[PDB]
Protein: Regulator of sigma E protease
Organism: Escherichia coli K-12
Amino acid sequence: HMIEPVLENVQPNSAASKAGLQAGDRIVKVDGQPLTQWVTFVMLVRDNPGKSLALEIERQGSPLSLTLIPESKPGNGKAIGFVGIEPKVI
Amino acid sequence: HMIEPVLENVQPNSAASKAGLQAGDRIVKVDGQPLTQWVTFVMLVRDNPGKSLALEIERQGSPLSLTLIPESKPGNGKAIGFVGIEPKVI
């Protein structure tokens, strides 16, 4: 296995904040695809600045659907997504 | 592109600290194996607790050679490498 898609910390507004995402939330689908690694999700975000992603998540074992919209960060090579989530500490 | 192997914050001992790494450092090779993505580096780590890593980095353009020995963290599925680095916020 690798790193499961569970939120460590969410910053304050912060796109992830505004969207309702909490620490401990687990991502289950994005745009109706299941995923199982954090990295899969990260690439998804970075690829969709200001585009809307539809998340099904598990929070306390119960389900939730949240719409999340990456902010747009220069990245200069060239324009990336940003939601403001602290990644689990390696 | 993707995410690059540049270190955001380093932590207080901590195999990464003992090993002598700093925020800003960029990983170039691990056991001669060149890398270009952050995750590539994360994998390498978690997969080698107690094992030891031939490192080549770039600090202010100046190349440099270091050795990392990841601590041995649970994960309990089953025993993972750890160094004490916080990843860029995402």
Remarks:
- Residues 38-47 of chain A form the longest helix (10 residues).
